[PDB]
Design a protein around this ligand. Structure first.
Ligand SMILES: NC(=[NH2+])c1ccc2[nH]c(-c3cc(OC(F)(F)F)ccc3[O-])nc2c1
Ligand SMILES: [Ca+2]
Length: 223
């Protein structure tokens, strides 16, 4: 997260870190046995780490659960990142409490101007790599479709939305991938891609979760 702030231990209880011997993507807990992340974060040997704040130290509240299976959207395209969403089922259910909780899926899509919270352990430098130990947060607005499409001509599908600042300085970045964009208590986006990080006129692009709620409910119901 570039230009963000320290969220504070366990203030984002649905945030999860996907770990394969190191933190490589974020994710969101949506029920005690399922997590939603980005299809581009797929890999085998994923351990889901819940209740995390400092990812390099055990300080209490963490639950490390192995993924039983990851379900990448059947129509995911890695060259366009269209349908960039993946569901991960946990080997056992997580214990939910105030530090570990799920986030609700949206009943409606959010409008431009909606302010959302984006969080992650991704890079905090737009030029170079600085990875924090603790969870960073950023409050960003969803942009209008015209500004999004004007920023990435021909690269935005209807399953993507842009959120961020065109002046630059504040944005999600590598390492934040797969994580949550929550607006009004609902999971509205998944950190997907962008050109560089916090670059002027290059806002972040997010998977539009409201378009996948029936797919998520149907897939969880049959697995
Ligand atoms: N500017 C953004 N809002 C943004 C968001 C997620 C990203 N994820 C990545 C990303 C970058 C990776 O390494 C690469 F820069 F060499 F391509 C690898 C995985 C990523 O998800 N870049 C990203 C940029
Ligand atoms: Ca920790």
């Amino acid at each position: 997260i570039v230009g963000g702030y320290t969220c504070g231990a366990n203030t984002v209880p649905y945030q999860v870190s996907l770990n394969s011997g190191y933190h490589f993507c974020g994710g969101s807990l949506i029920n005690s046995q399922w997590v939603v992340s980005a299809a581009h974060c797929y890999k085998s040997g994923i351990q889901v780490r819940l209740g995390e704040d400092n990812i390099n130290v055990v300080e209490g509240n963490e639950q490390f659960i192995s993924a039983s299976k990851s379900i990448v959207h059947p129509s995911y395209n890695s060259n366009t990142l269209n349908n960039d969403i993946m569901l991960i089922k946990l080997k056992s259910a997580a214990s939910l409490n105030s530090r570990v909780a799920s986030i609700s899926l949206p009943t409606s899509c959010a409008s431009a101007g909606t302010q959302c919270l984006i969080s992650g352990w991704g890079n905090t430098k737009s030029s170079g790599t600085s990875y924090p130990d603790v969870l960073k947060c950023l409050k960003a607005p969803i942009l209008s479709d015209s500004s999004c499409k004007s920023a990435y001509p021909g690269q935005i599908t209807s399953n993507m939305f842009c959120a961020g600042y065109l002046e630059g300085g504040k944005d999600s970045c590598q390492g934040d991938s797969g994580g949550p964009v929550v607006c009004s208590g609902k999971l509205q986006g998944i950190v997907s891609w962008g050109s560089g990080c916090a670059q002027k006129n290059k806002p972040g692009v997010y998977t539009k979760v409201c378009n996948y709620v029936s797919w998520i409910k149907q897939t969880i119901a049959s697995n």
